[PDB]
Structures are given as C-alpha cells and as structure tokens.
Design a protein around this ligand. Structure first.
Ligand SMILES: CCCCNc1c(-c2ccc(OCC(=O)O)cc2)nc2ccc(Br)cn12
Ligand SMILES: CCCCNc1c(-c2ccc(OCC(=O)O)cc2)nc2ccc(Br)cn12
Ligand SMILES: CCCCNc1c(-c2ccc(OCC(=O)O)cc2)nc2ccc(Br)cn12
Ligand SMILES: CCCCNc1c(-c2ccc(OCC(=O)O)cc2)nc2ccc(Br)cn12
Ligand SMILES: C[S@](=O)(CC[C@H](N)C(=O)O)=NP(=O)(O)O
Ligand SMILES: C[S@](=O)(CC[C@H](N)C(=O)O)=NP(=O)(O)O
Ligand SMILES: C[S@](=O)(CC[C@H](N)C(=O)O)=NP(=O)(O)O
Ligand SMILES: C[S@](=O)(CC[C@H](N)C(=O)O)=NP(=O)(O)O
Ligand SMILES: [Cl-]
Ligand SMILES: [Cl-]
Ligand SMILES: [Cl-]
Ligand SMILES: [Cl-]
Ligand SMILES: [Mg+2]
Ligand SMILES: [Mg+2]
Ligand SMILES: [Mg+2]
Ligand SMILES: [Mg+2]
Ligand SMILES: [Mg+2]
Ligand SMILES: [Mg+2]
Ligand SMILES: [Mg+2]
Ligand SMILES: [Mg+2]
Ligand SMILES: [Mg+2]
Ligand SMILES: [Mg+2]
Ligand SMILES: [Mg+2]
Ligand SMILES: [Mg+2]
Ligand SMILES: [Mg+2]
Ligand SMILES: [Mg+2]
Lengths: 475, 475, 475, 243
C-alpha cells in the first residue's frame, strides 16, 4: 500500500482518529492518538515527535526527542474503539539526520530482510508463528518487605473443582479442565468456545488469514489461534497486532489474557513456536527428498545455526526470567538442543508435511512470546544464515521422547540454558553472528544486556522466593 | 466575532440558557446562568452585576458590586448540560467608571498583548501549552486536631496490583500501570483510551483544533491532550475551557480529574509546558541557522529573561505549595535554571523542529496548571520582553542529564526555588519587569502576595505533616 | 562515685544484667545487655565494643569498630525489667587511641563543662529543664505513593466527646479535656492522676529529686513532671533517663508517650524550657538587686548571647521539622526574640523568684525535646558564654503579650526562625561561638547539618502534605 | 566441636524460649527484603601448646603469617567453601550490597563491608583473631566450622597470600576498582558446581569423604536448587504478566 491508499481508507471508513504505534525495545507496542484532521501528507513527509526517554531501551533524557515515519502497509481499522480509529505502525528515526534508529525493533527486521537478500542465499524468509496464551479471570500480586504473592484464577482451573461457588456466587457446575487436559475436549469442558470465536472474527476483520483456533493443553483457559505465515517483517507486525487483538477481545468480554511463558506451576507453558523456511526466486529451498525428514542441506545447516547459537540466541527468543520456568521437562517444550521429525519433545521439530516441496519447513519450539518478535525473528534468521554460511552441521537427530532418555544418553546432549543470566552472559561474550551486515549493532546488544540485567535479572535475584520459606523458615 | 454572531449562534442552537463566566484571581472560572430570554443587547451595552466580595482576590464587602461585559470571541456551546447552554467569558469592570478591573486576569492578558505591540519588538506572542492531568477514580482527605490524611485511587494504579477485587467487587484483571511506566503502552495497559477519545471529541465539538492525546508517564491514569497554539489571550481562554471540558468529561463518565502538580509521591508530576514564540508582520523572529539550537538573538534574549527572572516569575507560573513537590529530580520536571536542546531534564528545552523558521520555538517546562493561565502567560511574556529589551544573555546551555550531576557540579548551576514562600518573597522584592506598561499593577501584585501567604503558605506551615510522625513520634 | 561503688550496688541489688547505654547523635539512647558475670574490672579498664556504623551520626562501615568506657555516676537500677538490671551510661572512644570521640554527645557536654572552667567566668552551669509530653492511647501513620496519614488518639481528647463508645466498646463517660483546657482541673477531668503518680514513684526510686507533676494545657493527656536542676552533663543524663522512665511507665500501663514538639494541631505544643544559671566558688552570679528583673550583668549578657545566636542555636535546641510547628503564636511558646519577666509569650522569661540571689535565673522557653539534650545544653552554654565574653547587650525587655502586638511594634522585633532549613543554613554560615575551645568540632557541626538535610528536611519537602489536597485538588 | 554443639543447643533454646512466649523465631539468612539479613559471623583463631598463633605486632592488623595464610585459604577456597557455610538458596539473598554482609572476597581491619574483618583488639596477642563474615545459620555448624578449618589449613600449608586488604566501603568502590576484586558467588548452584569440581582441601586426612561431599551436592540439587528453579517467582508476574 501507498500513502494515498491509506488516506483513501481513512476517508472511506470515516475514521475519527489515527493511532500512531511503534515498538519499544523489550517488545510492547506504544501509542498515541491524533485526530483524522491532523492525518495528512505532512505525517508522511516530516513525521511525528515523541519522548524517546520514556520508552524502554531508547534515549537518555537530554537526547530525548525522536521522530516517527509511517509504514502504510500496517494500516488497519481498530476493532475495539467506539470512536472509529485507524491504527498505523511507524519506524523510529533520528530527528536531526532522519536516518533509521539503531534500536527501533522494526528497523532490525527491515535490516534483517535486506541482509538476507545481500547474501545471495535466499530472497524471502517465511515465519509462521504459534503464540499460545491463557485466558484467565483474574490476577493479583505484590512484593513487600515482609511478604510477596501472586495468584491467577480461571473458572476452568482444576484448582477450583472443590469451590463451593464461583467467583460471582453462582453454582460450581463442574466440567473444569484437568491439568494437562485442555487439548482439546468439546464443550462444556471447553469453556471458551464463544470467546475464541470472537477472537477469530476480530482477527478476520483485521485482515488476518486464519488457519485455526483451539483450547490448548493447560487448565484454566489455555488457547491457541493460528494465522497464515508471512515474510519476516510482516510476520512480526502480525504478531504484535495479534497480541493486541487477543488481549483486548478478552478484556472487552470480562477476561484477562497473559502471554507469559509459565504462569502455572505444573501445567503447560505458553510457547511461540516459529516455523521457518527460506525461498529464492519464487522457489522453496528447504526440501530434499533424500535428506533426513526431507530436509535440504540449506535447511539442515540453518538448523545447525539455531542449535549452535542457541546459548546466546535465546537471549532474544527466550528473553525473560519466566521463560526458563517453561524450559523444564514434561510439557512439550524443549530441554536440550536437538532436532527431530514429528517430535514435540525436541528443540526443533520437523512437522510431517509429506512430499510437497513448498510445505517443507522447520519448527523452532524454544521461543516464547515474552519479548520482541522483531528482534526474535531477526535473531533466528541471523543464526540460521551463519549456519548456512559456515555449513554448521547439527548433531544427529534423536527420534525419542527426550524427557525419558537414560541419564547417560542425556549427558552427551547439550541442554537448554538454565536461566536468563546465562544467555545474557553468553550473548555478551559471543554475538558476532548478530552483527553481520550491521543487522544488530553493538549499541543494541549492549543496551539489551544492560536492560535485562538491571530491570529483570537483579530485581528477581534479590527478592526472596516463597518456596524459600517452605524450605528454610525452620533452619 | 460580533454580538450579532453570538445572538445568531444562540438562536441557531436553540439555546435555553446562557452561562456567564469570568476568572477569579487564583485561576478558577466562576459562573452564573441567565435564561435565553434575558440574553439581549443590554447584556452587551450595560453588562451584568455580581458580588465581587465573594470572589477571591477581588473586592471587599463594602465595595462589593462589580460589572461584567461579554467577550463575543469566547462563545461556545456547553457539551454537558442537558438544557442547551451557551457559555461566554466576560471581562470584569468597575461599575461606576466602566473601566477594566486591575485584578481581572482576562484584563491582564489583554494588557500584555497591547504592551507587546507597543514595544515594537513583535506583534504576536504564540503560546502552545501541554496541561497534563490525572484521571482518578476517587479522592478523600481531611485535617483535624489529632490527625490528617489524603488518599487518591485509580484502578490502574500500581499500588493496586495486590488487590483481591476492584472497588466495585469485580475481579482484579491486572494490566495496571507501573510507576513511571504509563508513557505509553497499548490497551489494555492503557485503560483510558475510550475516555480520552470522549475528551478529544468534546474538545473538537467545542471548536478546538486538536493535535494529539496520550497516556502520560504516571501510574493511575496520567494523560495529556494537545490542541493548537494561539496568541496569548486566546490561548489562556482555551486553557480554562480545556480544563473544564476535561474535568466534566471525566465526571460524566464516573471519574475524577485533578490538574494538581504532584498528587502522587514517587511518580511523575503534571506540568503545563508552554511552547512560546514571537512573530512580527507575519514572519517568525525565533530562528537563526547559525545559533545554538537554531535560535536567533531575540530568542536567546527571551530565554535569558525567563531564566533571569525565574526566582519571582515562578510566583505566577508555579503558584502553589504543591508546585514545589513537582520541582524535584527524576520526573522530567526542572530542578535548575538551564536551557538545552532536546533535553527533558532542563528548565527550557528547545524541541527539535528542523530548519523550518516557522516552527522554531522554546519550551518553558517549569510551569504547572495549579494557577491562572492569564497571569502565567502574561508574566512569562513580561520576563521574555525584559530579557529582549535588556539583551539578557542566558548562561551557556548544558546538554546533560541534569538529575545525574554529582552534587558539587549540580551546585555550580542556579537551582529552581525550593518552596513557594521563597518565590513570593522574591516577587515582593523584585517585580518591576511585570509592572512595565502597567501590565501588572502594584495592587494586583500585593493582593497576590497577601492571598498566597494567608490562604496557602501559612495554612500548610502550621499543620503537622504525616511524615513528621514517621520521623519524630519516638524522639 | 567510683567503679567499686557500682560493683557494690550490683552485688547488693542482686543484679542479673547490666545494660550498657550511650547516646546516638540525634538524641536517642542506645543499649545492649551483658550478664552480671561479665560486668567486671575489664569493663572499666578495656571498655566494650559496638558497631559505630549502625549508629546515626557516627562511623562509616569501613571504620565501624568503636569503644565504650563506663561513667560510674550514671548507674541506676532499671524499674521495668523483670530480670534485675543495672543501667549505666558510657562515653564513646576511638578504639585505637582511646581518645574521646568527637561526635559522642556525652563528650560534648564534658568538653562544655571544662571549657566553662577554663574561661574563669564560672565553674558550674546549672540546667533545670521542663520536658512536657503527651500521654496518648494510640498512634498510626504511613506514607505511600497515592496517600499518607497520621492519627493520634487519647480517651481524654476533645475530638472524642461525640464517640458512641470508647475504643474498647465501653461507654463514653464524658469529662474529656477541652482544647487548651487541661491545665489543670481535678479528676475526673484529669484522667491521668494515677499514671502520673506511677511516673513520679518510678522517678523517685531511680534517684531523682522530684518537685512536681501535673496535667498540662493540651487535650488528650498532656503532662509535665519536674525534677531538681543539676550541672550540665548530669542534667543531660537526667533528661535522657527521665524520657526513658516516662515512656516505659506509660508503655507498661497500656499507653504511649510522645515528646514530639507539636503532635496536635490547634492545641499546645510540648516544650523543653531550660532554666539556667552560672555559679562560681559556691556563689551565684546571676543576681543584682538593681538590674531589670534582678538580673546581673553576667545574666543580662548571657541572655544577649542566647537571643543573638538564636538563629543558629535553634539548630540544636529546636532540631526537627516538627519543632517549627510549635513556634507559632497562641500556645505559650515563643514567636520572636525577646526577654521579659513573668512572661509566658516571651523567648526568655525571668521567673518571679524574689530577692534570694540563689534563686535568680533565666528560663529559655524556645527549646523542645525533639533532639539531643547533651548537644542542646552545651550549645546554649556556648551562646551565653560568647555573650558574656563579648558583653552582648540584649535589646530591651518587652513586658507585653507578644502574640498581640500592633504590626509596627512587632516588625521591630526579630522573629523566631520559620523552619529547620533556615536554622541549619545559618548554623553552617556562623558557628564560631560553638567551636570555641574545641567544644563543638567542624566534623560534628558538618555531620549534624548533613544529617538534618538528608534525613529530615528533604524527606518532608518531597512528600505532598494532605492539606495540599484540601487546597489544590480542584485547581 | 564444642562450639558446634553449643550452636545447635543455642538455636534450640532461642527457638523454644520464643515459642513458649507466644513468638516464632527464624534463623533464615534473608526473611525480609530490603532489610538486614541474619549472618553467622565466625571468629576464628589457632593456638598451639596453650599459646596463640595469630598475633604479630608488625603485621597488617597485628596479624601473623599463620593468620594471614589462614585468611588466604578462606578467600581462595570461598567459591567452594560457601557450599558448607552458605548452604541454601536463601543464603544468596543475603549476599547483596548495603546490609553489612560481604559482596566480594577481601579482608580488612575494622571493616563491616568485608568478607573477613579483623576486629580491633589492641595488642593482647590472645585476643587477635579473624572474623569470617560470609557464613549464615541456614545449614550445619559441624560441617561449616570443619570446612572453614580445612580451608584455612590448606592456606597455611601452601602459604596462600591473600590479596592486599582494601580499607574502604566495599559497596561504594568505583566500577573499575570493584571489577578488579573477586566477587562472592551469586547463587547456590554456582558454589555447589564449584565444590563438585574442587574439594580436595576438604578430603585431606579423610576429614570430609567423597560420599559426604556427593550426598551434599545431590541433596542440594534435588531438594533445594531444582525445586526453587522450577516454581515461578511472584515478581515474575509483576515483570511479565502483561508481556
Ligand atoms: C509461498 C510460500 C509457501 C510457504 N510454505 C508453507 C506452507 C504451505 C503449505 C501447503 C502448500 O501447498 C500448496 C501447493 O504448493 O500446492 C504450500 C505452502 N505452509 C507453511 C507454514 C509455515 C511456513 Br514458515 C511455510 N509454509
Ligand atoms: C502562524 C504561527 C506559526 C507558529 N509556529 C508553530 C508551529 C508550526 C509548525 C509547523 C509549521 O509548518 C508549516 C509551514 O510553515 O510550512 C508552522 C508552524 N507549531 C507550533 C507550536 C507551538 C508554537 Br508557540 C508555535 N508553533
Ligand atoms: C546550689 C544551686 C542553687 C541554684 N538555684 C536554683 C534554685 C533555688 C531555689 C531556692 C533556693 O533557696 C534556698 C536558699 O538558698 O535559701 C535556692 C536555690 N532553684 C533553681 C531552679 C533552676 C535552676 Br537552673 C537553679 N535553681
Ligand atoms: C584461651 C583462648 C583465648 C582465645 N582468645 C579470644 C578472646 C580473648 C579476649 C581477651 C583476652 O584477654 C585475657 C588475657 O589473656 O589477658 C583473652 C582472650 N576472645 C575471643 C573471641 C573469639 C575467639 Br575465636 C577467641 N577469643
Ligand atoms: C500441543 S503443543 O505441543 C504445546 C506446546 C507447549 N505449550 C509449549 O510450551 O511449547 N503445541 P502445538 O501442537 O501447537 O505445536
Ligand atoms: C513526557 S514529558 O516529558 C513529562 C513531563 C512531566 N509530567 C512534568 O513536566 O512534570 N512531557 P512531554 O513529552 O509531553 O513534554
Ligand atoms: C503552661 S506552660 O507555659 C506551657 C508551655 C508550652 N507547652 C510550650 O510549648 O512551651 N509551661 P510552664 O508553666 O510549665 O512553664
Ligand atoms: C551489626 S552487624 O554488622 C550486622 C551483620 C548482618 N546482619 C549480616 O548479615 O552479617 N553484626 P555485628 O556487629 O554483630 O558483627
Ligand atoms: Cl536469571
Ligand atoms: Cl512555602
Ligand atoms: Cl525545613
Ligand atoms: Cl541456585
Ligand atoms: Mg499449533
Ligand atoms: Mg500449541
Ligand atoms: Mg511485502
Ligand atoms: Mg507448534
Ligand atoms: Mg507533550
Ligand atoms: Mg507531557
Ligand atoms: Mg484574535
Ligand atoms: Mg512538553
Ligand atoms: Mg513548668
Ligand atoms: Mg509546662
Ligand atoms: Mg558531679
Ligand atoms: Mg516553664
Ligand atoms: Mg574438650
Ligand atoms: Mg560480628
């Protein structure tokens, strides 16, 4: 789409307001609103200003002003606002030089796409993502000198089977979801069919191409909705809008959604599986009839890159402390760095898609939805490209239940990282693959390490955990 | 606009009531209502009476009667009243001589504009204002012999993360705003989108030219809406009308708004930044390609005047005891008398606007919304004009995060005043720049000093602060 | 008294524990307990260690170890502890050189007495103090992001005349104390006769020579108990023990005492009037039958010193933010700097004592109990001695109600400081009178200033006051 | 041994005196966030033939070579020794700056921010000692005291020189200065990993045996480290619910 397309949409829809959006470093979309009357060619030619110092990972206070220029391909009508609103994503630019900003996540994605072309390896990188989430009824939490707590709740949570009444006083009618039992019985066991239909419809009406929706494994309202894959930048923009549409459809219907990796102890985490494939000149590159799981050398070496670089790569794909509570055995998330066809205990699964070369792809199952998809997709691509360039051979696939390996076989397989501080430490020590062609710059990597250490790792580390009192009060 | 235009508007809108408004000295608009049937030429010819002894800063009881003459430019339909009402601002006049009143804030702004033109320096002073505010749910407070309290509350306040239910008993659904984290994530973190759209719509339907609206930095529903700049008197009239529309939009939708400078301890205050520029014969005066931050000699001298006179000027721009709780480090409000491009820790920031001479301006960040915009804007202009007349050179810009200076280096730059009594004392001792051209008169200045001492400074000073019990109960 | 006298007291009283006490810089006594078996000659010869970095105004963490040596004159049996305990005060010493510590308040008092002797002016400075206090039932307070409160309560408090029941559910029986009506009606209006008797008895049994006890002016249980004057250091040790006996007699009897200067708004504060006189070779120096109020030149000049140095001296005599809430008119506390016989509105009153030269003395009415009496009494003495030495003539006595002076007359009389930051600034600017003879050192004065700014002034200044909500919520 | 028997009985007496009087006592290293943790500082000295060994008037802080080398052993072996002296997950919540507990491996006279403080005891040779400030009460005093002894004795035997004392507030050092000093361990799993890799000083003379060391490592991993690691922390909801 072009600027005039967007002006025509706004006029055609009788839009009242335009919501100007961009991505902060950690991965939350930021916005402000302008009236339809202020949305003119000047928005495209000169841009709009904001306080870069109030956005995480961006500017210091004395260098605060930043600029925004619109991306007309991202213009969509907002399904929630009573006053008719057009949402458009923007790129962040330096207000003096007008150059793209080194810490604009959307810029990283753009650079990644252009670096791919420049290598000659492929022209298009397709990302099909599965961002699971929980549909809860309530959450509360706090952290004080003498105590701390959290509690999430959901009508369908198995912890409520014994409740005398529901939250609102109405009767307990049963049909709650057993732990690991939500994938995927029919209603009334599935208590969220109507709400997910609203989610699906809102996505459809926002121009998503829908594939499917279902309850997921977790008790207390785990869900998954799939939309069609796209090329990297478009997929990442799609992910951000999807999260917005999911969260607000829930909110408007009395619920509260979370995309955090592991809100429930002892039930499935929420992943962001990323199906990936490279194409060049309109043809697939991932397929070879004679390869293990029908994979070409290009595909196998991409995988080699992901599994080789995982120790630093997870800093962008699994970027929170809570991420590492999901990387534990028994919940269809990864615990080690192996690939395998058909295998949901693996780090990379090769889904069964038959002999169609155009369907052949890898599913990187490690990532979760707790950070920034622009950065995560870009980092995954760079890992895979370094694998191809250096012909990195992944270790032999292991077609077994990886949670039930004998202790000795498990010992020779590199494990997933234990905690965020290890991946940040590793990113700091080796990130040359990310800086290739300037896709990630040193200031971005240094800002990310610093942000994670100061705002996440240390704040969790210094606070006593509730289970420490269960273990140690009586020492 | 003319009287006949106003009568036609009232006729065309089928107005039932006319609301007669004027400003008290501290800065609250005052009103009474007349029926449409009493709104005739006589209102314009002879005016309307009120009790000047019931208005703060006005008359003594034995000289009570005062007169009001309408300003037809200010006629606007009221958005809130069920009975269709037309609002009009009035100037206050002596009921014997019919001369403008020396303590009518609207008269001061009139006088300021005429004085500007008389100096030959410029013919127009443009003021663009950013009046931030909090959208709360409730407030309570008292002061007794043996105790005193206040509490503000907001569903989005971070202090409520641990709440078991919301005030109405419905579940806690999270997405509350972190302290200093409100600028500006998408919904549902931003819980006020629909309400701010209603504010924007009401402003647009009252004739404002809107620029933008967003959540601000503060937890608990801080917000900002910007409308287009105008010349001084119009801008001050807009400001008063804006406060009224914001407040009542909030009220009609179950909320309560404050424009107080510092309602929350440890989170952002609410400022009233005033972007200012001088024009003459339809051409800008602020721009010089060769100057630091693109500023002309005229612009620099105006800044020199603001920062030179700040010690007394703040008596009008930062006119409350609570004003000085905002002027503390770490919250994008000023703590010293520095100007600097791009710098949200400075007293005067030069926004980055490029090489367009018509956009070049200064942002005076010290002011807040706690007083009287007619007086604030007028005092700012008088300081600026004194700076120009005396060629007052500002001290060199300091392009640093001003909150992070070590103490010995912080001390080398002039600090903002600590408390209201200091700025009132200073105004008392030095105010000649304000009395130039008779813009502010001695009786205005003395009334202001006396009012603030007797009704604000002393009442706060004699009341034990709750934190004194924290410090001293056990002495 | 000697070490052997203390060992015999401990033996005779069958003491089980000894409580080692010393004074921190702000004025709170500190303690730890040793078993009687560890109270031996070594305590007198080698001293005892503590963590100087955990005591306010003392050491940094890398120079933390300090020493304590006993003062056998201060040994008394503790009235409250079930296990028979002997309390003894200690002097603080450098653990390397064993020299007295320059920030030990008990050392400052010591140094003040010896300085006095070294001048030849006198050999003894007597201090008779009247430390008023409130006997409350309860107190709570807090300070949060969105709110702050305090409340004190007392059965006799006038704010309770309308209570349907007492705190414990029993009936409201009336006879509550009117504001400013507590001095001093008979029971049952006085609801604390039996408790003040217990206070009197505990004091007597701890070796005080009692003079009187009574209800004071304030509602909600204001009280005063007076014991016989003593020379400076003894007087200061007595004050500290008195505060301890008062607070713990109340506590053991279900009440809670504060010595804060102004716990109630609109009722009397709590002062610490300090009657003072200089003697030499067993003869008085303050008397002259021909002077105004029978005052000698020595006495007049001492008064001169007090009133001249007041603007910095109150940094030690009136050392808290709350102090300045008491220094307001209408409550028998001072509001300006004069002396006057018989006059309870004055800063220095000469009590009516007749022709007895041995009774002649001044009452400095300004001081309160919110700080450190070692420092307070020492600073007063150094001011008076500077006055004697430089023959500072006080301005003429004003024998009138100083709250009710006409405006002209009042403005010709220097006022008391308005606030703590003003007296701290003044102390920083002029403290030579205090450093005379090394009695106060620069490190003490610097630590005091720094402590008050960082730990009291700034913390109150940054917190919104509840009355700011009353004034400004609706701005 | 008497000291470790004393410690166990003391804890029993404190806990039960509290309990019989309506209260409840904990010896856990960090029950309050943003206030002081609870340490178990261990003052230590070696004597032979009824004579003290720690004193030398001419040494820094009046310390002999034998004392200095004992300190060398403590600071050198600290990365593994803390498995016995700081043996719980909660231990590492205490080892954070601002609360008079150690954050790096230095000795210093008079210094409550250091790992080893030398208390000021004047010139009496029988009072001269070191205070090892890192340990807490969350484990086993028999094993902690024994492990500290074995560390110090290894220091004496190999004459391990400690790095020079730093007589400064160790929480406030400039970054370049701070980065040049070895830090205390961050978490239990780091000290357990380190103990597993190097425990020879402890097995000397068969004081600690391999079966005790291996049982300790396995106990901590299975019953403490892994159970806390797999449970979401409340503050993760504060940080991440809205991601
Ligand atoms: C034009 C690009 C097709 C990409 N292939 C592809 C497909 C796909 C599936 C079936 C297809 O069959 C149609 C055909 O070619 O006959 C073609 C493509 N599905 C995914 C999912 C994730 C990802 Br990543 C790639 N995917
Ligand atoms: C006609 C008066 C234009 C004043 N300039 C001006 C503008 C402005 C911004 C852009 C402009 O570009 C249009 C043009 O001249 O090409 C012109 C003017 N924005 C502000 C905001 C606050 C204040 Br104060 C002044 N502002
Ligand atoms: C031996 C010293 C007597 C000091 N005089 C003195 C007295 C006093 C009062 C009455 C006296 O009469 C006894 C006599 O000498 O006949 C003697 C002394 N009362 C106070 C109160 C506060 C202060 Br300060 C001094 N006071
Ligand atoms: C007989 C053994 C004396 C040990 N010295 C010693 C002492 C001590 C303190 C003072 C002493 O003085 C008595 C003397 O010898 O004159 C003697 C010994 N205090 C401690 C505390 C912890 C530790 Br570990 C050792 N301590
Ligand atoms: C059923 S599952 O294997 C569950 C994945 C799990 N929630 C995870 O943490 O990755 N997902 P899918 O079948 O959609 O790939
Ligand atoms: C984000 S901020 O810098 C916040 C200003 C702050 N509330 C104050 O002036 O106190 N304002 P803006 O970017 O609108 O000028
Ligand atoms: C009755 S009063 O004058 C009251 C003094 C007041 N409470 C003060 O604040 O100084 N005291 P006194 O008669 O005991 O000297
Ligand atoms: C006052 S302190 O330094 C406090 C020690 C702190 N609780 C710690 O965690 O080691 N203890 P001590 O002076 O008893 O050695
Ligand atoms: Cl971590
Ligand atoms: Cl003030
Ligand atoms: Cl103050
Ligand atoms: Cl651990
Ligand atoms: Mg799926
Ligand atoms: Mg799934
Ligand atoms: Mg495209
Ligand atoms: Mg999948
Ligand atoms: Mg703004
Ligand atoms: Mg703003
Ligand atoms: Mg006009
Ligand atoms: Mg601004
Ligand atoms: Mg008295
Ligand atoms: Mg009294
Ligand atoms: Mg004596
Ligand atoms: Mg008195
Ligand atoms: Mg024995
Ligand atoms: Mg110790």
């Amino acid at each position: 789409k072009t600027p005039d397309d967007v002006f025509k949409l706004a006029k055609d829809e009788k839009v009242e307001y335009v919501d100007v959006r961009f991505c902060d470093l950690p991965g939350i979309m930021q916005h402000f609103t302008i009236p339809a009357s202020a949305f003119d060619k000047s928005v495209f030619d000169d841009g709009l200003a904001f306080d870069g110092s109030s956005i995480r990972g961006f500017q210091s206070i004395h260098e605060s002003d930043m600029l925004l220029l619109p991306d007309p391909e991202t213009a969509r009508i907002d399904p929630f606002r009573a006053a008719k609103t057009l949402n458009i994503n923007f790129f962040v630019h330096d207000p003096f030089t007008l150059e793209p900003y080194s810490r604009d996540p959307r810029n990283i994605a753009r650079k990644a796409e252009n670096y791919l072309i420049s290598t000659g390896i492929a022209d298009t990188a397709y990302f099909g993502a599965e961002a699971e989430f929980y549909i809860f009824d309530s959450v509360s939490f706090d952290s004080r000198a003498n105590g701390s707590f959290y509690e999430v709740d959901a009508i369908s949570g198995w912890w409520n089977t014994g409740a005398a009444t529901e939250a609102d006083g109405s009767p307990n009618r049963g049909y709650k979801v057993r732990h690991k039992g939500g994938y995927f019985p029919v209603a009334p066991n599935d208590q969220y069919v109507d709400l997910r239909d609203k989610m699906l419809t809102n996505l459809i009406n926002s121009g998503f191409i829908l594939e499917k929706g279902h309850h997921e494994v977790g008790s207390g309202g785990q869900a998954e909705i799939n939309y069609q894959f796209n090329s990297l930048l478009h997929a990442a923009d799609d992910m951000q809008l999807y999260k917005y549409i999911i969260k607000n459809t829930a909110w408007q219907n009395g619920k509260t959604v979370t995309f955090m990796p592991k809100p429930l102890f002892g039930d499935n985490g929420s992943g962001m599986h990323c199906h990936q494939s490279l194409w060049k000149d309109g043809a697939p590159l991932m397929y070879d009839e004679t390869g293990y799981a029908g994979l070409s050398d290009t595909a196998r070496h991409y995988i080699g890159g992901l599994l080789h670089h995982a120790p630093s790569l997870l800093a962008f794909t699994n970027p929170t402390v809570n991420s590492y509570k999901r990387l534990v055995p028994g919940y269809e998330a990864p615990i080690n760095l192996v690939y395998s066809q058909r295998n949901r205990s693996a780090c990379v699964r090769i889904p069964i898609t038959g002999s169609n070369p155009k369907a052949k792809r890898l599913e990187f199952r490690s990532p979760d939805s707790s950070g920034n998809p622009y950065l995560a997709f870009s980092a995954m691509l760079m890992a895979g490209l370094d694998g191809i360039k250096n012909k990195i051979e992944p270790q032999a696939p292991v077609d077994k239940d990886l949670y039930e390996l004998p202790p000795e076989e498990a010992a020779s397989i590199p494990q997933t990282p234990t905690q965020l501080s290890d991946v940040i430490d590793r990113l700091e020590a080796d990130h040359e693959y990310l800086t290739e062609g300037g896709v990630f710059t040193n200031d971005l990597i240094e800002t990310w390490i610093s942000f994670k250490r100061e705002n996440e790792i240390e704040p969790v580390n210094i606070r006593p955990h509730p289970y420490e009192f269960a273990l140690y009060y009586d020492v």
